[PDB]
Design a protein around this ligand. Structure first.
Ligand SMILES: [Zn+2]
Lengths: 32, 39, 287, 548, 40
């Protein structure tokens, strides 16, 4: 298949986006 | 200064295991502590 | 039976009473009464605490004056609202938390009246910010200890969460009494009115901070910062040398220019920028 | 017939008594294991641990010899272990109408009437366990005794059993006596009515009932009444994807950490298996921010419930959070793996669970053993080699005296989890269709809350599911099919206890024959048998097998 | 035009995967060292 090769690969862009925001939160939370 | 801070983020690696104290020495601390409270 | 899941709710003011009266009379084991609001077999609440004056010279839990707890019990009765005597306390000064042989007898006199009186230990000396050491306890039956029957019938994963101190394990701890988990009753209304009311500078940053001596003090750091920078022209020159953990064990007698330097850089920085901007708002705001 | 068809397909008792037939024909257990766990005779949790362990490994098999071995050590502990004892009988007699009243004829509350009102009190609990999702005489017989009884010493069993049997029905009259069970203002009826109050209203979003529940859970002084409703208002909404968000934000906004925790359960149940962004930002965000540890533990234990569709992603993100400063987030991290990847033998997840027992906190050492049990049920040494690496480990931690009771409680629990039903039952939050198994979902979410009620995680029998094909030609007649497989027969490995005081791949299998879901593809169809399947054999369960 | 169109997206998304992955690997170790300082 080729049709899943783009949708399931932007799926991990949505999955990828949250994590830098997460370590962004823990970056201050481990300080305070 | 700030570029010497942003470029200082390439050495941080291989910081794998942060052992708190131990496990078996904690168990022997519980045993000897239990003996000292037993006395 | 109890379920080792008691979860004492207390207060916000009673802890302040405990540290004040337990602190001002520090070397003597001071005490007092706890006038709370009794609820069910599971939980118990104590909202108010009034202390008791001492008997004489001597560190002890002592006795009670039921004249004094009578009229003092009737004192707020005629003014505020009635409550119920739910417990009592004392104050180990520098000890930790347990029940002494003196403490367990006056505990035994107080559980006989109501079975859910509470022995409370405060220790306001081993506390710094996130510490209170309010490990409150209550007796367990030595009769059942002679029976060898294990008490308190754990039905909830709420009791064995905190780990006991070894000094209480030296004392009674689990042979005469039991531990109790607590929390703190907070609201919105008190949190703001302490938060906005603790350290508020009034008009201080709208000043100039000793306008002759701001720059003079700025000299008074830079002048020795020069020779400390000569130490920074001294300490670099023993690199490519013996194994810088040796440069860690070895610098324990004489100061390093590095940390001492970046101290003074920050001090001069925050010293200058604040006076710089605060000098300039007034030129616009004042005409 | 076609008139009898709605009976044949809507009662569905030819999976109930036929998987019960599979349990009475298929039972692979041990007594020697419970003899090894017999050694810890003390008045700790150990009594309830063992008597919930044999109920965990004897689900629906009706085997009364592990209980009928004794009465003194069984009836040694009291006041809730007898409640748990009369609780545990229904999972053993699960899925069978007849042996519900007649074996509990000793345990009627008006025949013997002992000093233990829980031994005669928690019976209707177990009737609800047998006839969960079976609404009949259990409703009215477990309704009229609830009209007139004692206090919450039988009302726990009748209330939880009645909402359990009437789970997700909205019959509105069980909601009525759950209102008068609700407004008792009693801390001990809070557990009785708070959970069933959501159970009968599962997925119903009756906003006036929401208004009654969250309206009532704002002014009471006790917390168990604040806790049964905390899961109930999560349970009233189920898989809505947007329709709860005002309520999620409302519960999250309030200063009550129990209510914010309940908002985390509610956003956990409104996004089941759904990899949504709006859930994963703030659901994980709070897990940073909030100061109570309970809401953090549920906040990280929502991740497998919202992300069990793909188990490939939670070991990538929760491994990052197994090294938190607090053992609460370290604990709910391990249970987040344990609810995420439990359907598979994920080598990465076992790799993450390996150093989790090394932590100096007893309950995260415990939850490492729970997740270590859930990862590898019905998996024998060829899916992953850590099975026998851990069989010595649970025995290693249960045969020590100097370990914690709370630490080894995950081991004695993990035995009945690990050897459950004679290696015939398993967990499945997921059908082959792509649809989830919502009593397994509610059973595992309710299975999380063994904290504040120990037989609360006894509600797990809705998660135990078969892995077995069944051949059939008519409504009733068993065929005699003898098919085989093709691949490596070491996949067909057994527990095989050791009992200390030339390779056939043609596995001939009858109609009550277990088969691994990985082994669903490696089989061979019966090509020379008289019975030949009209259906392409892909799923287990019950299928047609045409006599040709 | 499925060749010149649909395959023209896999060539682009991968570039975001490569460097945002690298930034993530930087930032999680960044947190790691501090987390070791907290536990220690
Ligand atoms: Zn004292």
């Amino acid at each position: 298949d080729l049709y899943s090769r783009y949708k399931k690969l932007q799926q991990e862009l949505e999955f990828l986006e949250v994590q830098e925001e997460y370590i962004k939160d823990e970056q201050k939370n481990l300080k305070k | 200064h700030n570029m010497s801070v942003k470029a200082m983020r390439f050495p941080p690696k291989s910081y794998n295991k942060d052992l708190e104290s131990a496990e078996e020495r904690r168990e022997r601390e519980q045993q000897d502590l239990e003996f000292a409270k037993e006395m | 039976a109890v379920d080792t899941a008691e979860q004492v709710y207390i207060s916000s003011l009673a802890l302040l009473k405990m540290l004040k009266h337990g602190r001002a009379g520090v070397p003597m084991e001071v005490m007092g009464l706890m006038l709370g609001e009794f609820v069910d077999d599971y939980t118990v609440r104590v909202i108010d605490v009034f202390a008791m004056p001492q008997s004489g010279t001597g560190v002890s839990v002592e006795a009670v004056d039921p004249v004094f707890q009578a009229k003092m019990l009737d004192m707020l009765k005629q003014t505020g609202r009635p409550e119920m005597v739910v417990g009592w306390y004392h104050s180990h000064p520098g000890f930790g938390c347990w029940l002494s042989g003196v403490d367990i007898n006056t505990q035994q006199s107080f559980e006989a009246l109501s079975e859910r009186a509470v022995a409370v230990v405060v220790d306001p000396i081993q506390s710094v910010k996130g510490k209170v050491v309010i490990d409150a306890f209550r007796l367990i039956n030595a009769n059942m200890m002679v029976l060898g029957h294990e008490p308190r019938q754990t039905t909830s994963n709420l009791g064995h969460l905190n780990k006991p101190s070894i000094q209480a394990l030296i004392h009674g701890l689990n042979r005469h009494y039991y531990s109790i988990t607590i929390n703190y009753r907070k609201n919105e209304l008190e949190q703001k009115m302490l938060l906005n009311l603790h350290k508020k500078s009034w008009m201080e940053g709208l000043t100039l901070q000793d306008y002759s001596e701001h720059c003079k003090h700025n000299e008074s750091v830079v002048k020795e910062m020069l020779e400390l920078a000569k130490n920074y022209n001294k300490a670099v020159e023993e690199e490519d040398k013996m194994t810088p953990e040796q440069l860690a064990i070895k610098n324990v007698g004489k100061q390093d220019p590095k940390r001492h330097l970046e101290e003074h850089v920050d001090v001069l920085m925050t010293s200058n920028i604040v006076q710089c901007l605060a000098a300039m708002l007034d030129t616009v705001v004042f005409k | 017939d076609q008139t009898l068809k709605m009976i044949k397909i809507l009662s569905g008792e030819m999976a109930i008594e036929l998987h019960l037939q599979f349990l009475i024909r298929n039972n692979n257990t041990d007594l020697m294991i419970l003899k090894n766990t017999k050694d810890a005779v003390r008045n700790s949790v150990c009594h309830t641990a063992t008597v919930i362990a044999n109920s965990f490994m004897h689900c629906g098999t009706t085997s009364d010899q592990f209980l009928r071995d004794n009465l003194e050590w069984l009836a040694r502990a009291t006041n809730w272990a007898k409640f748990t004892a009369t609780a545990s009988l229904g999972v053993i007699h699960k899925g069978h109408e007849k042996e519900a009243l007649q074996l509990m004829a000793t345990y009627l509350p008006k025949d013997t009437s002992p000093g233990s009102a829980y031994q005669e009190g928690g019976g209707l609990y177990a009737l609800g366990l047998i006839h969960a999702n079976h609404g009949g005489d259990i409703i009215d017989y477990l309704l009229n005794q609830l009209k007139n009884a004692s206090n919450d010493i039988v009302r726990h069993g009748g209330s939880l059993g009645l909402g359990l049997a009437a789970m997700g029905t909205a019959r509105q009259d069980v909601y009525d006596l759950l209102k008068t069970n609700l407004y008792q203002d009693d801390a001990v009826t809070g557990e009785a009515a708070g959970l069933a109050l959501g159970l009968v209203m599962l997925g119903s979003k009756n906003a006036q009932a929401i208004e009654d529940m969250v309206g009532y859970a704002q002014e009471t002084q006790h917390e168990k009444i604040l806790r049964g409703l905390a899961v109930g208002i999560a349970l009233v909404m189920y898989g809505r994807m947007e329709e709860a968000d005002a309520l999620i934000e409302s519960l999250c906004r309030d200063k009550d950490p129990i209510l914010r925790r309940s908002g985390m359960y509610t956003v956990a149940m409104a996004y089941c298996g759904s990899g949504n962004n709006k859930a994963i930002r703030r659901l994980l965000h709070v897990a940073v921010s909030d100061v109570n540890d309970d809401v953090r533990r549920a906040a990280v234990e929502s991740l497998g419930f919202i992300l069990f569709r793909t188990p490939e992603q939670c070991p990538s993100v929760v491994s990052l959070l197994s090294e938190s400063y607090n053992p609460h987030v370290r604990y709910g991290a391990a249970m987040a793996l344990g609810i995420c990847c439990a359907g598979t033998g994920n080598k990465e997840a076992i790799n993450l669970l390996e150093p989790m027992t090394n932590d100096p906190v007893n309950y995260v050492r415990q939850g490492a053993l729970i997740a270590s049990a859930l990862i590898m049920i019905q998996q024998t040494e060829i899916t992953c080699p850590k099975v026998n690496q851990f069989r010595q480990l649970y025995s290693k931690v249960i045969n020590d005296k100097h370990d914690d009771v709370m630490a080894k409680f995950g081991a004695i629990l993990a035995q009945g989890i690990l050897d459950a039903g004679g290696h015939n039952v398993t967990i499945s939050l997921q059908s082959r269709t792509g649809h989830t198994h919502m009593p397994s979902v509610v059973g595992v979410l309710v299975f999380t809350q063994f904290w504040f009620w120990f037989p609360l995680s006894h509600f797990l029998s809705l998660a135990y599911t078969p892995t077995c094909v069944i051949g059939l030609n008519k409504d009733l007649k068993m065929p005699k099919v003898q098919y085989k497989s093709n691949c490596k027969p070491s996949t067909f490995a057994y527990p095989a206890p050791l009992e200390v005081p030339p390779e056939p791949n043609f596995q001939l299998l009858d109609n009550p024959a277990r088969v691994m879901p990985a082994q669903l593809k490696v089989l061979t169809m019966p090509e020379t048998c008289r019975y030949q399947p009209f259906k392409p054999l892909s799923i287990g369960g019950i299928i047609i097998l045409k006599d040709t | 035009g499925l060749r010149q169109y649909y395959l023209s997206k896999i060539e682009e998304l991968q570039l975001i995967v490569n460097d945002k992955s690298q930034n993530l690997r930087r930032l999680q170790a960044q947190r790691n060292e501090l987390n070791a300082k907290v536990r220690l």
